[PDB]
Amino acid sequence: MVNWAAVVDDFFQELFKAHPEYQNKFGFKGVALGSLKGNAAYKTLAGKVVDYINAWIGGSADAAGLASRHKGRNVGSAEFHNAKACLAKACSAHGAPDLGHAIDDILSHL
């Protein structure tokens, strides 16, 4: 039983460390990284990312839909390549399987 919630938390720490400006697009803009887990906007968003990972594992993920919604937020290939690397670190740090192919699937629609 992978703790995907823990992996996603480390994913966002990696993501926003390397690219702080990405955080500006979220409802938790401006919040200190060490404080994120206590922020209500963050908790909801991280929960949806955990949901997406479990949908991919479970076979129900909609990569086309997720890509389209991110393009709608002006988030594209460059950002998702960066996210891929950040998620790879977060999985490794928790002994979790690599999610590279899930990200590749989103990338194919970007």
87 counts as binding ligand HEM under rule CB under 6 A: yes
What minimum distance in Å lies between the beta carbon of 75 and ligand HEM?
4
Q: Which stretch binds ligand HEM (CB under 6 A): 30-38, 70-78, 90-98?
A: 70-78
The annotation status of 94 as a binding-site residue, yes or no, is no
- The region of 31-39, 76-84, 89-97 touching ligand HEM under the rule CB under 6 A is 76-84
Q: What is the DSSP string of the chain?
A: ---HHHHHHHHHHHHHHH-GGGGGGSTTTT--GGGGGG-HHHHHHHHHHHHHHHHHHHT---HHHHHHHHHTTT--HHHHHHHHHHHHHHHHTTT----HHHHHHHHHT-
- Binding region for heme: 70
Binding site for ligand HEM (CB under 6 A): 22, 25-27, 45, 48-49, 52, 66, 69-70, 73, 75, 79-80, 83, 87, 103
